Ligand binder design. Structure first.
Ligand SMILES: Cc1ncc(C)n2nc(CCc3nc(N(C)C4CC4)nn3C)nc12
Ligand SMILES: [Mg+2]
Ligand SMILES: [Zn+2]
Length: 313
């Protein structure tokens, strides 16, 4: 009850920054996450014993794939923590509780393949969920783990608060389907520009939380250049494995996933930063001004990919 998690001084200071890297020591990631829940939400949000037991069941249900792993889960939750801390008063007690949990859970039991590969392989999950296949699976795995004995971290919530937080988590996780991001940002762009955007409109909040989820999920592009560059290697290791599997089904993969087009990675990153990342962090900065450091970091990393193409590294 009187038990504060603290971190060594360098982590205690740097964890507050958007560009924080959670480091290579796997055994400190749970402590880091708990530290963030305590400062974001309070020491009273969750029964510590249940939270720790929930964190370790979430960890056990992420796989040893190169990118969509437990490190990704905690990284995406840290980005959300920074957004929530820099926008203290804009979010409800339930949203603060629900979103950190949503981020930790958003890629639960990922196998390192896109919704497309599941559909072209005819994986059973593609018959159970026709769109946002993995993302409906991820939410499903979240509910399963919440229903394990000693794991219901929301037990102190009311019947209606409980349903509200599970619905925040569902929409948050669904929104990490990048196919849904483009439309969601286009609507937010217009609503902000015409001045119709209203954070008392629940459907407006939904869209804004959805954009925060895309921002957090993509935050590898907002890190110091060496973190950004080395995460890109992990991202392509999954994509190229998927490309190999596409070829095994007798299908030319998209260039993104073809390890034979390694040479084109720098140009593919430019496309990605211009089509996806920059517009994402731009719109987010408009709606939530204190998130500007994510936009600024993203533009710096774009400029580093430009330098790679020009042979200056
Ligand atoms: C950094 C990051 N974070 C999240 C995600 C989902 N991605 N996806 C990419 C791939 C981007 C991309 N690469 C290509 N290549 C290499 C084609 C051969 C030319 N095309 N495109 C669009 N990078 C990210
Ligand atoms: Mg995902
Ligand atoms: Zn993710």
């Amino acid at each position: 009850g009187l038990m504060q998690f603290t971190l060594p001084v360098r982590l205690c200071k740097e964890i507050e920054l958007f560009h924080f890297d959670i480091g290579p020591f796997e055994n400190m990631w749970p402590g880091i996450f708990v530290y963030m829940v305590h400062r974001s939400c309070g020491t009273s949000c969750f029964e510590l014993e249940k939270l720790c037991r929930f964190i370790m069941s979430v960890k056990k249900n992420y796989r040893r794939v190169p990118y969509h792993n437990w490190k990704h889960a905690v990284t995406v939750a840290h980005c959300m923590y920074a957004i929530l801390q820099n926008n203290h008063t804009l979010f409800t007690d339930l949203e603060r509780k629900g979103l950190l949990i949503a981020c930790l859970c958003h890629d639960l039991d990922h196998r390192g393949f896109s919704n497309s590969y599941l559909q072209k392989f005819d994986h059973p999950l593609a018959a159970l969920y026709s769109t946002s296949t993995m993302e409906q699976h991820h939410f499903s795995q979240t509910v399963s783990i919440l229903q394990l004995e000693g794991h219901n971290i929301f037990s102190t919530l009311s019947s209606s608060e409980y349903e509200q937080v599970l619905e925040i988590i569902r929409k948050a996780i669904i929104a990490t389907d990048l196919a849904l991001y483009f439309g969601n940002r286009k609507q937010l762009e217009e609503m902000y520009q015409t001045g119709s955007l209203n954070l008392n409109n629940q459907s407006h909040r939904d869209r804004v939380i959805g954009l925060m989820m895309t921002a957090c999920d993509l935050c590898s592009v907002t890190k110091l250049w060496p973190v950004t560059k080395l995460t890109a290697n992990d991202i392509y290791a999954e994509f190229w494995a998927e490309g190999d599997e596409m070829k095994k089904l007798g299908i030319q993969p998209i260039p993104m996933m073809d390890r034979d087009k390694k040479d084109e990675v720098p140009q593919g990153q430019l496309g990605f930063y211009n089509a996806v990342a920059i517009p994402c962090y731009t719109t987010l900065t408009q709606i939530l001004p204190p998130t500007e450091p994510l936009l600024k970091a993203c533009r710096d990393n774009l400029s580093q990919w430009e330098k790679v193409i020009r042979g200056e590294e």
